[PDB]
Amino acid sequence: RVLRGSRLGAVSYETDRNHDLAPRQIARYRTDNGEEFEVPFADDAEIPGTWLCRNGMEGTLIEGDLPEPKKVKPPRTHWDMLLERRSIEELEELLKERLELIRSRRRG
């Protein structure tokens, strides 16, 4: 009869010890627009120099640890889409025909 539900998460019942914790470092992070952010990592924890902060952007670490700059590639350009079907000499002949077209526009 009664329809029941469960939000898919675990609920335990323990003591909130504010005294007996795992000790922990705090890493300061600096974003692109100079925003400071102090992420609490654990003690036994590798600190990534990059971190998506609370700002909604990427915030690098406040030290000069030199993370990897790009490790990426450009997606594609309209010129790449153009070059997949046409020749460089084809586009250069079109460039010369539009040069003559602007010549007829200008002084012809």
Binding site: R7, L8, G9, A10, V11, S12, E14, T15, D16, R17, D20, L21, A22, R24, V39, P40, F41, A42, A45, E46, I47, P48
Partner: peptide, 22 residues
């Protein structure tokens, strides 16, 4: 959603508290 549980499940107990799983 799970009590004192990081999402990847590395830290899972109340000893780890107030911290963020890297």
């Amino acid at each position: 959603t799970r009590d004192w549980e990081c999402y990847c499940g590395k830290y899972k107990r109340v000893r780890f508290k107030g911290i963020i799983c890297e």
